[PDB]
Design a protein around this ligand. Sequence first.
Ligand SMILES: [Zn+2]
Ligand SMILES: [Zn+2]
Lengths: 65, 100, 473, 200, 452, 205
Amino acid sequence: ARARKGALVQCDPSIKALILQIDAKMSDIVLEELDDTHLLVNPSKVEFVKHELNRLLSKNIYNPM
Amino acid sequence: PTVCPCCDLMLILSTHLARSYHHLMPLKTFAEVPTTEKFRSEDCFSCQSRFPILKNHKNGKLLTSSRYRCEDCKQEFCVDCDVFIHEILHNCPGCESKPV
Amino acid sequence: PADFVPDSVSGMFRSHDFSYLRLRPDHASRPLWISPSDGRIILESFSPLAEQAQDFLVTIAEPISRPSHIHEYKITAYSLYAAVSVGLETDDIISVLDRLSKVPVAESIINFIKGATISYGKVKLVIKHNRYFVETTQADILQMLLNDSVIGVHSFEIANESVEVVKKRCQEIDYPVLEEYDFRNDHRNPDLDIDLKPSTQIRPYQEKSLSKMFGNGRARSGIIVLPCGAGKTLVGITAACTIKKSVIVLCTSSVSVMQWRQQFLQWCTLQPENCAVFTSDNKEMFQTESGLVVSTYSMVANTRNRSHDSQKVMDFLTGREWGFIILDEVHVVPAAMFRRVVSTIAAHAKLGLTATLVREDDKIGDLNFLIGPKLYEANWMELSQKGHIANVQCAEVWCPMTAEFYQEYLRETARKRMLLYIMNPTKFQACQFLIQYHERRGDKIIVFSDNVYALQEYALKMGKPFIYGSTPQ
Amino acid sequence: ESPSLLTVIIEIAPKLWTTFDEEGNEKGSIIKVLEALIVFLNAHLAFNSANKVAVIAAYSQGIKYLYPESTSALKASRSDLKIINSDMYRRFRNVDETLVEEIYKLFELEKKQIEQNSQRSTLAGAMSAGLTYVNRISKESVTTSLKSRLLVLTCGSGSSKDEIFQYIPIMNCIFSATKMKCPIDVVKIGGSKESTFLQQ
Amino acid sequence: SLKHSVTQYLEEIPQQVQNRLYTSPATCLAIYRILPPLAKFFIMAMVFNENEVPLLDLDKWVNSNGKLQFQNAIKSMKSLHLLIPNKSSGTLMINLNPTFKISLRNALTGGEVQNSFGVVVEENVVSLDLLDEYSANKWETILHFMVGTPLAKIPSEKVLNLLKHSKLMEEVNSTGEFKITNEGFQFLLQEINSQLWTLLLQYLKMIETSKMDLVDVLHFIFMLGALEVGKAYKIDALSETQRIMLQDMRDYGLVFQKHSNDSIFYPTKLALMLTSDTIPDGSLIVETNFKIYSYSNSPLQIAVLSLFVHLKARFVNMVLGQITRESIRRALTNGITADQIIAYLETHAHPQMRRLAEEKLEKKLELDPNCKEPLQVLPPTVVDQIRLWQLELDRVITYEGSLYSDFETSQEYNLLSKYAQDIGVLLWKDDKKKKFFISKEGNSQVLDFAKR
Amino acid sequence: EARKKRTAKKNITPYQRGIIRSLILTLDCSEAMLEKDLRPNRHAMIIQYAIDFVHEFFDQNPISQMGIIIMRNGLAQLVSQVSGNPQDHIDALKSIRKQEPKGNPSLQNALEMARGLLLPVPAHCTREVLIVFGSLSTTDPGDIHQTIDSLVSEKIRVKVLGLSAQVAICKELCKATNYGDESFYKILLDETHLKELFNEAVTPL
Ligand SMILES: [Zn+2]
Ligand SMILES: [Zn+2]
């Protein structure tokens, strides 16, 4: 019966593993590991999760010049 | 229209009779007006569309004018009215506007 | 610029705003747009005068891509060399481009056409008594080149190995090398009685490729790209029958050597006494004055200590002046020492036949100096809609990985990562479902996988046979 | 929904309207019919912005278009007479002014040519002209998906009986209007209750 | 849409404001022309009789297959307060609105109109070369600044703060610039008549000042709808709020005036096409290699193309572009959704793409007539790539709120979770993890429930 | 060219035409309608053009009656009796549109059943048979000149819209049944000309 600051996020298990490992890199991302589909990322770092998730998925994208 | 199944009598309507009067008497075709002939009107009779300059070439002037004079009422018609009066209609508005 | 002020939306065109070209009044009939920046040609195929421009553009240009409505072509130096080889000069090329283009042809494009087409055919490589000479019609062209002098009417002899160096240097300079074989007037090489059998029919795209090769009545060295099953082997047979000189065919495998020998003996009137095979098991040569030899790139370019009899066969191949070489799968020619097979064999005409003219390094462009310019490219969609090749439905099936496999994929190095994304169970399920569905549809299915362990695991899981390198023949 | 062309075939015969005035207590019923038609055409133009109006008058010696006026008169002209007030809606007001000026010109012309008496009614020819105008506007199609509708304002007045010679043209008009899906409305302002041909 | 939007606004207008609005004949004429055909037919059948009309007569007028449209027209007129029901002698009797009836009858027959259609001074300017050019210049200026091309000329600060107070045209001052929104690109999607109507409706929404009188504002708008292009009108027939809004519409481009504070003004072509509407420019070709060839010479359409197409070259007829990942992500980060991008591509698809799609559909129906497929005018490969880029933008969606856990008793967690489900702010719940989550707007209710 | 067309239409004369008609629409439905020289195939577009012909013929000639016979598998098949209701003929043509055309055509069998159908037709009502012939040869059970003579004796006028080329038996049948008039044997050129032929077939002879 306690209260905290957090933001729920929907993801497939691939993005779940990605945000868990970016939490392991920088521990101030997810408050707790929740389910295979739902997580609780930090509201002050939601935009950082967006930006670094796009950058980390950019290695899976072929970009012709 | 069907034959009566109880007394072997043919049952039609007035419109069923009238659908073939244009096959009985047809409309005489509209005459192409001469280019040098004096033109009665600048617009169609039953349509009042313009007859344009129709200069086919530089010195064509009023060559092959789009007027179609009727043989009876001497009224000029455009190409759309010439097709329409001979195909969809079957009667000449000039010939009926003529007060015989 | 034609005294035309930039518009408000000229900002995001990085000096590509070509609105200064005044539009012609009859631009609806003309199907072409000329880009002055890079020589790109934009063709509309739905307009009239479509194919009448398309043959002209495939003559003078290399197509980047040929979709349904709008085609793109590139004005290229090699394409202009092909145009002046087949007999189109600067005047009528510029005139037809001007008449067929909506916008006027720019002065930069006209000057590029003039510069590319001019100085053509001045330097030539000829082979005289198994010895490479380079010859110029003008005397000063010999004396102007002085940087790469590999010297050994006006002509001088170059070394056997330095032929590619000379060709690269003359491509860097504005004097490109002319490599065309006049097999009518070449009487010093012994002729062959090889000819096509009367029961052999040649498809129109094969005819177009061979017309590009023999357009001016002389055999031009170059590359023909045709899909698998489109008859590149038959194009090779027909080119050999057209040249009617001694033919050497270099393949990538011994089964390809056997196939090429069988295709010659099936489609053309070449005798088995005139045909020879240089492989591991077969090393006897034809005893006639001219004929066919089919061998492999590895056997020809084996710098290892080869056997005595194979050394004798190599001496025979080197000492003969060959009239025609067919390089099957020419994409492997730019390799480290597959490159030297075009030097160790002094052939007058060189035709490279392939389906896959790509390499993952930048050495694919060295084929213009090894074999010759890109003579012909088949339009695969046109062949598919004509029914010459199959109509394939290409699809990419996305298999979402499981959580455990993705975690392990993240916490491993690249070599384990490859096997770990190959071995995910979602691809098992998708492949098994597709196998079942197409087996119900009655299809012959080939499941390609380079990973041998993955191939074996999928085959044992699905109950289907597997073939890899260590399997017995 | 969709705009329409309302073509009004109005039979302004001096003989028939004089007999109607003599039968009724009032005089000059042509004015009342004409002003009711003017308000009705303004109503039709108020129904939709893009809809169109044509009027054809069938007088004693032929037919004449009332709105729009003849293009020869358009090229020659404009003496804007003050029958209709100028403070009303202009998009109705040009239509109304052209209609009333053509009414005045037609009445002046048949006052000049009043001596010739004809037994040949031109209602069928006017309806045929209206059908040709409907076909013309439908084929021109400057406004897409234009419907059309004929309204016939005729008067019997108990003087002219049923005319046999009109049977064939009215039947042909029926077939043409049925082909073009153009309804034909008939208003008969008179004493004789039955008009079989226009009823059909 | 257009008629639906103006009908919704006129329904939101209160009843006495509507009765004051029905004074001018031109406003009544425009409002009448908004109505559905059965409503219009009943209105004109009921104008010319001063006595009473029942609903039973109107219901007998309609056929059996048009009863739904009859109900739609009756509800539309009742919401617009053009019909007054009366309950006497057991029959629900209907009156037309008296002010609307008088004004419509005056507009039809001609009479007293208190210059609701203006006055003409017979001196004119050329419509196509000057009036259309001015109106087009103002519209191109407003849409060019709106799509964000570099402009030497920017519009007036009145429409600037209109655009920043509107739903579309987001703006930041940390960067100091404006962004096109989802409805901002939708605005470019519909036709310019509905664009002008939605701009005018948002302007009507934001005018709350005492300097603007709303009935006079709508009188001026519907009067401009009633007027004609190419001939002049006097300002002297207008009130002062209509004068200053004549200046505002001069800034917009709906009306042209030769000089500021002039006695004479000239309505433009947008004033007439405000009422109703009436290879093409901007028609574009899409290929499977994501190449775009757009037959557009208009800088507006080139600029709108640049919001999601990586432009490469430009000719007089057509522009070269390529639908690339970073350009589509630019549009998606600007909020232009994949559905409306594909809608723009369909609406500007080329007739040659149309006929090739027709040929493909003909071959598909002659091969497999059992199933029917929609007309795919543009390549499904590029359509699926656009939707896949939308999905790769929207891989994760974030909601912020509170999670209540560490409950020793499951009954209290179940009570809190069912309370959250009842108040409708719950997103997830589970007893196995003992966790339920709520939104930020729903945090306060559960917080006061737990505190009390 | 427009003046040449007007010259070709100048020959206008109020010919007396039989208004009350009894038309027998005979359609080839043999293997020759499997040819793909017409889009999408001969049988399907002849059925569709015949549906349009039924609508146009009953629009312009209401009083007239019509029956529908097809030629299939060496026999003539009646698909609708002679009646004045166009809806039954539309339904019959729609039913025949599904089935697959196969067999060898039989002009004699088609003409014999047409003669049987036109036998109870009254004398005031004209007797006409419009044959859409797709093949170039016909397989007859007996002599076809006897059938042609019987048609001439029964006063049945035959007009044939051929598809491929001019067949002499069809030309002689049209000539004999139309009293030396060789203009009643028509062969199409294009789809527009076939539509023009079906539109010409609705006017009274
Ligand atoms: Zn006309
Ligand atoms: Zn006439």
